[PDB]
């Protein structure tokens, strides 16, 4: 399978385009591995039905 290691990015952040996540622009994965070491670091946001927008 093709694994993309998110490191200190959540997939949602990656998408939204948080500075320290722009490493990931345009990337493609079979399985996206969200690490517990991960954070966010840009305007503070909420996404109602975050749940689903990740999925």
């Amino acid at each position: 399978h093709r694994i993309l290691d998110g490191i200190d990015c959540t997939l949602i952040d990656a998408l939204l385009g948080d500075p320290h996540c722009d490493v990931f622009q345009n990337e493609t994965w079979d399985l996206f591995v969200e690490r517990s070491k991960a954070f966010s670091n840009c305007y503070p946001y909420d996404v109602p039905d975050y749940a689903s927008l990740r999925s």
Partner: protein
Amino acid sequence: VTMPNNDNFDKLYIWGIHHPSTNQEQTSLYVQASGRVTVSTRRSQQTIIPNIGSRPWVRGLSSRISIYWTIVKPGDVLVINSNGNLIAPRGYFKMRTGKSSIMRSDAPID
């Protein structure tokens, strides 16, 4: 503004709305008293209204962004209307469909 989906695949748009902490900040940024954001395709619709209020201080700010997505199918056309508070998109994502998923883990690759 408006932006056809004339390809033959589904476009995804992530957009959002700003909720400020005070009316001083509102009038400063978006000149109106109360804003509003309505993003809509032909078939569906969502209007989100901001909420001028003070939240936990976080990396400086006690203001906030809320995030919304619209999917626009082929033919279907997207339309964004607002009189303030808008966090607009720059475009879309390709929506594929397939066996791709997301796992939460802390163990190393090899």
